[PDB]
Nucleic acid binder design. Structure first.
Lengths: 110, 68, 82, 92, 73, 95, 93, 110, 95, 80
DNA sequence: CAGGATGTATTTGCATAACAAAGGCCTGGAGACTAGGGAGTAATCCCCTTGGCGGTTAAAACGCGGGGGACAGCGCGTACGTGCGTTTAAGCGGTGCTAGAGCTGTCTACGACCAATTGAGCGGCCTGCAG
DNA sequence: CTGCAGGCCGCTCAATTGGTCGTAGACAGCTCTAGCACCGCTTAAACGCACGTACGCGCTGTCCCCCGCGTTTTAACCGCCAAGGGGATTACTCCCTAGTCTCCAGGCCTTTGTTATGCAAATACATCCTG
C-alpha cells in the first residue's frame, strides 16, 4: 500500500478507491446495528472493491476471448462461471442477457 | 515504409488546414468539388488520426495532397 | 379481459428454450407440461410483485417489485435493481 | 435517484484493463452486484452482533461475515485486504 | 492544457461580461440561455470576427502546443 | 441436400446457448403476464421494464429446468424429453 | 438468567383444543423453536417493507403484508383475519 | 368478538393468550425497525397464536391416530405433513426425532 | 426357509419409516465430527447436545437424498441404486 | 484420532437408505454416500466452529450448530 | 473433387457524448468537540466436559449359496425431425389522451420516553399419578 | 416406576398507566412522465402438410452382484467416579462512537461549435454437409 500517512479523503486514507465514507453511512441504515465502528467500512470497502476487481478482470478476459475491447453483461456472466468461487457467490444470479455456457454432452454428439 | 509516408502527410495536412483556417468538413466537401468524390468530415478526421486502413489512406491521400 | 395467452407461447418458443438447455428431441406432450410449469413460476412471481405494489397502495407494478419478488425465491435479477 | 458505484466500478476496471471499456448495462449489473454483497455482509454482521448481545458492528464482525459468505481462497484475499485497509487507515 | 474557444464561446465571453456585469444578480444559467439565442440572431458580419477569432485561437493554441489533442473521459 | 435429423438440433443448441436475446415473443408474453395479474386484481399496470424483468426471469428459469430435464433423460438413456423427465427434476428440486 | 420461552402459552393453546391431551417437554421444545422461527420471519419481512417504503415504523399493516408473503393459501388468510381483527379490536373501545 | 376491552393484560384485551406486551418488546428489539406501532405486536401475536393452535390441533389428532393422549415431537411432525400449507411453511424444518412418513412406492411391491 | 429377497428389504423400509431412533452409532459419529473439526482447529470441544443436534441434521439430510436417489433409480426403470442416481439427484438439487 | 468415516457402518448407511425407500444398494453406494456425508459435515462443522471462534471461545454450542445449519437453508427444532 | 449454404473479420456513416467560460448554489465529506454508555479487564465460583474403568451383550464382520434383476442385443412401429408453401400477427413507427407516479408543504395524531404503580409469572419445593 | 402436572409461598421485575415532547406519516394539491390504446405497413416467424427413418419400446437370454441367513468377533453402550478447564457472573474502569456544529472543495447548470467515439450496417474470405 501507500508509504505515506498523508490523505485527502477517508478512502485515500485507507488506500481504497471505494467511497469508504459512504459505506460507513450505508451501514448506519437498514437497521443492521445501533452502532457502527470506524474500521468496519474500511474493512468492508476493501472487500467490495476486491471482489469487484476480480469479476472485472475475468470479464475483461472474457471480452478478449470474444476479441472485444468492451465488457458487456455476457462477459460478466462468462467470467462468473469460469471462476469456481465466483460461480458460487453469484452462482444463482440471473444476468440480463447473460446467455449460457455452450455445453453439449458427448452423448448428444455423433 | 508506407505507414511512415502516410503519417508524414497526415501531419502536414493537418498543419496546412489549420494554417489556412479550414475545417475538416471543408476538406471533405472541397474534395467533392475538385474530384467529384465527396468525403465526410469523419473520414477526414480519421485520415488525420490515421484510423483508416492503408488502402483507404492511399486512395484518399493524393486528393488531399492536391487540396493543400 | 385476457384469455388463453398461455398459447401465446409458441412451440418454437418452447423449443428454443429447450434447445438452449441442451435438448435435441422433444415429445409432443412437452409443450403442455412446460406451459403448466411456466405458468406457475410466473404466477408466483407476479403475485408477490402485486402484493408489494398493493402494500404501497400503488396501481403500477414496478420492475423493482418484480426484483423483490425474485429476491425471496433465492434469485436475483442483476441490471434491474438492488 | 439512488446511490451507485458506477464511478468506482469504472475506475477499478481500468486499473486492471486500462484499454477496456464497459457498457451501461454491464455497469447496471455491477451496481446490482455491489449492493447485493454489501447487504449480505452487513446482514450477517448484524446477526453476529445480535447473537453475541452487542450493539456495535466492527471490522471483526465484517471479517467473520466475509468468511461465512465467501468460499475458498476468494475469502482469504478479501480478508487480507480488509485487515490491511483497516491497519493502514489507522496507521496514519 | 485546455481547449481553444469556438465562435460562440469567444463571443459569449464578451457578452458574458456584457450581461453579467451590466445586468447584475443574474445567474450564469440564465445568461447562457440568453446568449445562445442572442448569437443565433446575429448577422454573419457580427458573428464573423468571433468565428475567425476562434480560428485564430485554435491555430495559436496548436502552434503553442503542436501535439495537443482533444480527449474527453 | 437435406441435413440429417440431429444436425439442426445441435446447431440450435449451439446457437441459442451462444445468443443472449429473448426466445419468447414479447407481446404474447406481456399478455400472459396480464392475464394472470387480472386474477389478483383488476386495473393493474406494469412498467415496460417490469415486463422485461419477468420475461428474463422466466426464460432463465425454464432453461435451467430444461437442462436438468435433459440430464434426467440422459440418465434414463434417452435423447427425447418426456413430461416425466421434467417432473422428476422439479420433484427433486422441491417444486 | 434465562431467555423467555412460550411454553406456558403453547400449553394453554393446546388445552383449548384438546383439553384432555398432554404434551412432552421435547414437543414443547419443538413448539418454542417454531414460534421464534415464525416471529423472526414476519418481523424480518416487515422490516423490509418499511425499508422499501423508506420508513422507520412498522405497523399492523406491514405485519399483514408480511404474513401474506410468508404464508401460503388459507393459513395466510386466517392469520390475516385474526390479525386484522385483533388490531381492529385493539384500538376499539 | 368479546365485549371486554377493559382488560389490563394486553393479551386478554386482544382476545389472545400470547404475550402481546412481549411481542411488542421483541419487535422493538432485533433492530427490525426504529419505531413499533400499537397494532403491530397485536396483529403478530394473533398470527403466532393461530398457527400455534393449528399445529397443536393437528398434532392432537396425530396422537389419537397412534392411540395416544399426548403430543410428542413425532405427532407434531405428522401434523405438519398432513396439512399441505402447513407443510410448506415448515417444509424445511428438521424435527428432533420426527421420523418420516410411511411412503411406500408401488414399484417396490411384489 | 428364507424370506425371498426383497421381502425383508420392503419390510425394513416400512419399519424405518415408523421409527424415530437414530441409525448411526453415536460414538463413531462423534469421532467423525471431531477428526473433521481438527482440520480447522485442534483441542476443540463440543456440547453433548451439539453432537446430537448435528447428527439429527445429518441423518435427515441423507434420508432426503436417498429418497431423491430412489426416484432417480425408479426413473431408470429399476430398483437397485447406483452412485449415478445419487449424483443426478445432487446435481439437480444444486449441490 | 483419524479414520472415523469407517465408523459409519454398512448397516448404518443401509438403514438410512431404507428409511428413504431404498431396497437394493450397490456395493459402490457405501463409498459414495460417505463422500456426501463428509462434505455435509465439513460445511456445517466449519461454520459452527467459525461462530464459536467469533465468540472468542473454545466450546462449540448446540446453537452454533443451529446457525451453521441455518445458512444451509435449513432449520432444526428442539435444540433452542 | 464439387458445389451450395452458413459464420467471422474488416470496413463505413449516425447520433451523442465530453470540453471550453463564469460564478452562485448544493450538498456531501472531513474536522473538531463533548457526553456517557458499551466493551474490555481481572477476579471469583461452579457446571459439565473430558477421560478412564470394567462388564454385558446387541450390532457388525465375514462366508456361503441362491436367484432376481441389471445388462446387452435384436427387431418392429411410429412420432419426431426435416423441408416446402401459405397464412398470421409481431414488430416498427408515429399519434394522441390522461391516470397515476412523484414532489412539495402543512400540521397533527402517533409513538418514544420518563417516572410511578401494579400484580401475572419465576424459581424452588411438595406431592401423588398416567404412559 | 420416570417425568408430567397442579398447588403453594414470596417475591420481583416486566407490564401497565398517565403525562410531556417532537416528528414521521397522513393529507391535500400541483406537475407532467410514461403507460395505454390505436392505426397502418412490412415481413420474419408460425401454421399445417407430406415424407422418411432414428429413436423408443418391448422381448429374449446370459450371468453376476446383492440378499438372506448362520456363526464368530468387535466395540458400542451402560453405570460409575474424579480432575479441572472453561463459561457465567460481578464490579470497576477507560475510551469509542453517536450527536452537534463549522466550514471547504468539488461538481452542477448553461449555451454553441470542434474532435472524437461507439457502434449497426455492408463486403470478402473461410468452413461445412451432402453429392
Amino acid at each position: 500500500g501507500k508509504a505515506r500517512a498523508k490523505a485527502k479523503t477517508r478512502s485515500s486514507r485507507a488506500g481504497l478507491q471505494f467511497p469508504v465514507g459512504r459505506v460507513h453511512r450505508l451501514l448506519r441504515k437498514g437497521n443492521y446495528s445501533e452502532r457502527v465502528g470506524a474500521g468496519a467500512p474500511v474493512y468492508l470497502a476493501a472487500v467490495l472493491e476486491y471482489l469487484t476487481a476480480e469479476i472485472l478482470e475475468l470479464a475483461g478476459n472474457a471480452a478478449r476471448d470474444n476479441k472485444k475491447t468492451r465488457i458487456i453483461p455476457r462477459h460478466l456472466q462468462l467470467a462468473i462461471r469460469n471462476d469456481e468461487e465466483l460461480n458460487k457467490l453469484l452462482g444463482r444470479v440471473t444476468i440480463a442477457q447473460g446467455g449460457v455456457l455452450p455445453n453439449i454432452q458427448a452423448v448428444l454428439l455423433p | 515504409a508506407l505507414q511512415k509516408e502516410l503519417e508524414q502527410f497526415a501531419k502536414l495536412l493537418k498543419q496546412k488546414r489549420i494554417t489556412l483556417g479550414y475545417t475538416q468538413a471543408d476538406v471533405g466537401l472541397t474534395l467533392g468539388v475538385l474530384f467529384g468524390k465527396v468525403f465526410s468530415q469523419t473520414t477526414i478526421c480519421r485520415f488525420e488520426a490515421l484510423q483508416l486502413s492503408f488502402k483507404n489512406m492511399c486512395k484518399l491521400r493524393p486528393l488531399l495532397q492536391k487540396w493543400v | 379481459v385476457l384469455r388463453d395467452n398461455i398459447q401465446g407461447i409458441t412451440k418454437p418458443a418452447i423449443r428454443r428454450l429447450a434447445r438452449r438447455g441442451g435438448v435435441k428431441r422433444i415429445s409432443g406432450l412437452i409443450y403442455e407440461e412446460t406451459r403448466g410449469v411456466l405458468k406457475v413460476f410466473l404466477e408466483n412471481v407476479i403475485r408477490d410483485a402485486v402484493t408489494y405494489t398493493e402494500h404501497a397502495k400503488r396501481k403500477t407494478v414496478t420492475a423493482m417489485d418484480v426484483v423483490y419478488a425474485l429476491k425471496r425465491q433465492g434469485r436475483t435479477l442483476y441490471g434491474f435493481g438492488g | 435517484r439512488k446511490e451507485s458505484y458506477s464511478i468506482y466500478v469504472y475506475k477499478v476496471l481500468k486499473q486492471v484493463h486500462p484499454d477496456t471499456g464497459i457498457s451501461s448495462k454491464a455497469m447496471g449489473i455491477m451496481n446490482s452486484f455491489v449492493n447485493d454483497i454489501f447487504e449480505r455482509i452487513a446482514g450477517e454482521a448484524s446477526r453476529l452482533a445480535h447473537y453475541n448481545k452487542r450493539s456495535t458492528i466492527t471490522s471483526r464482525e465484517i471479517q467473520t461475515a466475509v468468511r461465512l459468505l465467501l468460499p475458498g481462497e476468494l475469502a482469504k484475499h478479501a480478508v487480507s485486504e480488509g485487515t490491511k485497509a483497516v491497519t493502514k487507515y489507522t496507521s496514519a | 492544457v485546455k481547449r481553444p474557444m469556438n465562435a460562440f464561446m469567444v463571443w459569449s465571453r464578451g457578452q458574458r461580461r456584457k450581461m453579467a456585469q451590466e445586468n447584475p444578480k443574474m445567474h450564469n444559467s440564465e445568461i447562457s440561455k440568453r446568449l445562445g439565442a442572442e448569437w443565433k440572431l446575429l448577422s454573419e458580419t457580427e458573428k464573423r470576427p468571433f468565428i475567425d477569432e476562434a480560428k485564430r485561437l485554435r491555430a495559436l493554441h496548436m502552434k503553442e502546443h503542436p501535439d495537443y489533442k482533444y480527449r474527453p473521459r | 441436400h437435406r441435413y440429417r435429423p440431429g444436425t439442426v438440433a445441435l446447431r440450435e443448441i449451439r446457437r441459442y446457448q451462444k445468443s443472449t436475446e429473448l426466445l419468447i415473443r414479447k407481446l404474447p408474453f406481456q399478455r400472459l403476464v396480464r392475464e394472470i395479474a387480472q386474477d389478483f386484481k383488476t386495473d393493474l399496470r406494469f412498467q415496460s421494464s417490469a415486463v422485461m424483468a419477468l420475461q428474463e426471469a422466466c426464460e432463465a428459469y425454464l432453461v435451467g429446468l430444461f437442462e436438468d430435464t435433459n440430464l434426467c433423460a440422459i440418465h434414463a438413456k434417452r435423447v427425447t424429453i418426456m413430461p416425466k423427465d421434467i417432473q422428476l427434476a422439479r420433484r427433486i428440486r422441491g417444486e
